[PDB]
Design a protein around this nucleic acid. Structure first.
Length: 106
RNA sequence: GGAGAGGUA
DNA sequence: GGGTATTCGCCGCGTACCTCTCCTAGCCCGCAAGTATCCTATTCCTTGCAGCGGT
C-alpha cells in the first residue's frame, strides 16, 4: 500500500523543470581534468536532458565500477544547485560519506 | 469393482 | 511282503433383495520456511581523574 501510494503520488504531479545554462556549465565542465568517454558523456547528456524536463527524473546509472560514475552525479548536482535546489547525496557508509565530501569539496 | 457389518422374505 | 488299521489332509455346506463403511506402511527428497553471525545508522546510560572557585 505505502509503495503504491508513493508511486501514484510521484507519477501524479509534475516535478521541477530545471533551467540549464550553457556557458556557465561549460566552466564547470572545464574544471574536469579528464575527457568524458563517449558513453559517460552520453549518460551525462541523458541525465541533464531528463532533469531539464517538467517530468520527475527517475533514472539509473548502472555502469561498471571505476568508470567515472560519480562525475555524472557531480554534473547533475551542479545543474541542480545552479538553481538553488539543495542536492542531497545518500551513501551507505561513513567512508563513502567522507570520500564524496572530499571529492565534492575539491 | 472388491471386502466387512447390519437388515427383509 | 501284506492285510490291516490308523492318521492326515482335502472337499463340501440355499436363494433373492435392502442399508451402511472402507480399499497400505513407511521413507525420502525436495520444497520451502523459518533461524545464528557481520557492518553502518539509531536510543541507553554509568564512571575516573584533573580543574577550580573559594575561602
Amino acid at each position: 500500500a505505502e509503495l503504491l501510494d508513493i508511486y501514484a503520488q510521484r507519477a501524479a504531479k509534475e516535478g521541477f523543470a530545471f533551467k540549464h545554462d550553457r556557458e556557465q556549465y561549460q566552466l564547470f565542465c572545464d574544471s574536469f581534468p579528464f575527457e568524458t568517454t563517449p558513453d559517460q558523456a552520453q549518460a551525462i547528456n541523458a541525465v541533464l536532458s531528463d532533469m531539464c524536463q517538467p517530468l520527475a527524473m527517475d533514472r539509473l546509472v548502472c555502469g561498471d565500477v571505476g568508470f567515472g560514475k560519480t562525475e555524472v552525479a557531480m554534473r547533475a548536482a551542479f545543474l541542480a544547485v545552479d538553481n538553488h535546489k539543495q542536492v542531497a547525496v545518500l551513501v551507505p557508509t561513513t567512508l563513502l560519506a567522507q570520500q564524496h565530501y572530499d571529492n565534492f569539496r575539491d
